[PDB]
Design an enzyme around this catalytic site. Structure first.
Site, mmCIF file in Angstrom:
data_model
loop_
_atom_site.group_PDB
_atom_site.id
_atom_site.type_symbol
_atom_site.label_atom_id
_atom_site.label_comp_id
_atom_site.label_asym_id
_atom_site.label_seq_id
_atom_site.Cartn_x
_atom_site.Cartn_y
_atom_site.Cartn_z
ATOM 1 C CG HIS A 194 -0.403 0.201 2.510
ATOM 2 N ND1 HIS A 194 -0.210 -0.820 3.415
ATOM 3 C CD2 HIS A 194 -0.039 1.340 3.145
ATOM 4 C CE1 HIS A 194 0.300 -0.329 4.529
ATOM 5 N NE2 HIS A 194 0.416 0.978 4.391
ATOM 6 C CB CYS A 219 3.415 1.170 7.045
ATOM 7 S SG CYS A 219 1.768 1.417 7.783
ATOM 8 N N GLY A 268 3.287 6.450 9.262
ATOM 9 C CA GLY A 268 4.584 6.314 8.633
ATOM 10 C C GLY A 268 5.441 5.189 9.179
HETATM 11 ZN ZN LIG Z 1 0.729 2.496 6.035
#
Ligand SMILES: [Zn+2]
Ligand SMILES: [Zn+2]
Lengths: 306, 306
Positions: free
Chosen positions: B41, B145, B143
């Site tokens: 994503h 991720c 942020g």
């Molecule tokens: Zn994310």
């Protein structure tokens, strides 16, 4: 979101960790530029630690009596000296992994990360507070001496702790990197009292603010109090007295959440007098005091290091 | 002695962390050999995450639409592919800092260290368990991720987790390094239920053994029980059922302490039915379940990594 006890990334300190052996004693040293720092009782046998005369013991040691090993590489020792309770071993090679660093003597209540080491090798990392009675509650087995505590600000490592001793009560004591003990402790295997272990009040308050930021709101009461009246309660529960300096440091957390510092004080007082009635706050069933106001802001803002 | 939640030294994983940007989305990637791994994503806008068609979104992306930055250095992307919920970005440069590594899919109840990162930069490190409902209770801001979870055995890093999502309940969900989610979660901003969050029974028992090893003995009762009778209680308190495999894994801790596993089970049952009456165990006022039997042995034995 979420809130966790977090240590600093430890890669910068891993690159500085070495093994120091003298006679039959082995512990950890910290290698920065061309100097290795380690606890002076590397020169002690088990028997010596009962009552060591460090000056007389060190007289018998020469440069070559200190084996300093980094990985599978021997560093050549070209000089040695005792600074308070640390030895400094001059080596003929500067550590190519030395980060930007400082030595700092931290204050009671401040926190730092410990890189637990054995035989010069990193084993794990965890967060610690310097208690008001100048002990730390750590995880240190035999051979962990010379492990360090530190903080990281951007690209600079601030070393603040070196581990030396476990007290017979099971808590831990050590020095700054100039060899000066935190607290009234000495590097001798004799019975040593730390005084009353009080709670870091400003830290508990920052943690309650972190709880509010993360949605744990149940403990918010509708009382306020005064500094003097709160401290009346705080002394009863062996809490550090809260001062205006502490209020000032909590300012930003107060501002963000809209909860006046003295209102949070009234909520904490109620928790102190009523307990938590079987509830939890940020996953804990007691009041946590090893998060500083800066620790909270750091984690609720995502500060990074390079 | 002493007992602490400890993360692995994180230096090996710090050397692998990069920043990945696609369009206006930036998160973390993991750079091992000549491949950068990151959540798919990265190709999503905020709007896309409501209901993304990842195949159709990725069709619009070419190699040059992926900016991969390590420090102040741009890695050139020469290939990309989607494996389940991760992208793999082939780069023209192998990471010179790549450690010996593996990808592993861990089991519920096992633990690992998370290196929380932002914009490719390490922020902190903490220990996590994969809950029985396949969530983790972490500390992840926007942020974060692409942050990874790992274990270290000697010189080998076993990557087991990559962070993708915060559920609307505030807990966290992610994948293994093949992009397969732990649990029934999907990388979409829609409401997602994790089932009942049960307690890792074998972990609680290992922690009670760690308590006994460290001198916390008050909870030792004079009852025993049976596996079936204990599990009767365990189901009432939403505890995982204890099996003989779990008993077997606790064997060494049983042997060292002289406390039969079913005796500890009877002590835990009493704690479950009576609470802790205002006491603590290893400094905690609830029963801790994010220490594995191997975590206990590791810390009570001082295992090192190189
Ligand atoms: Zn994310
Ligand atoms: Zn020692």
């Amino acid at each position: 979101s979420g809130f966790r006890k977090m240590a600093f990334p430890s890669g910068k300190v891993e690159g500085c960790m070495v093994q120091v052996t003298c006679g039959t004693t082995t512990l950890n040293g910290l290698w920065l530029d061309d100097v290795v720092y380690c606890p002076r009782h590397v020169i002690c046998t088990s028997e010596d630690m009962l009552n060591p005369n460090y000056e007389d013991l060190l007289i018998r040691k020469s440069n070559h009596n200190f084996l300093v090993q980094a990985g599978n590489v021997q560093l050549r020792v070209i000089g040695h000296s005792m600074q308070n309770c640390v030895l400094k071993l001059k080596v003929d090679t500067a550590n190519p992994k030395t980060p930007k660093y400082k030595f700092v003597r931290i204050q009671p209540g401040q926190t730092f990360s410990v890189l637990a080491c054995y035989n010069g090798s990193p084993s794990g990392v965890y967060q610690c507070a310097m208690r008001p009675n100048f002990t730390i509650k750590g995880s240190f087995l035999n051979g962990s001496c010379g492990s360090v505590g530190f903080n990281i600000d951007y690209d600079c490592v601030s070393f603040c702790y070196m581990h030396h001793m476990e007290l017979p009560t099971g808590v831990h004591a050590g020095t700054d990197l100039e060899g000066n003990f935190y607290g009234p402790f000495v590097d001798r295997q004799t019975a040593q009292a730390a005084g009353t272990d009080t709670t870091i009040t400003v830290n508990v308050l920052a943690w309650l603010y972190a709880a509010v930021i993360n949605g744990d709101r149940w403990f918010l009461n509708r009382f306020t109090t005064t500094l003097n009246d709160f401290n009346l309660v705080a002394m009863k529960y062996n809490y550090e007295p809260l001062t205006q300096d502490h209020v000032d440091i909590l300012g930003p957390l107060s501002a963000q959440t809209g909860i006046a510092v003295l209102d949070m004080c009234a909520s904490l007082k109620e928790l102190l007098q009523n307990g938590m009635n079987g509830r939890t706050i940020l996953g804990s069933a007691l009041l946590e005091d090893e998060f500083t106001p800066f620790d909270v802001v750091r984690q609720c803002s995502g500060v990074t290091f390079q």
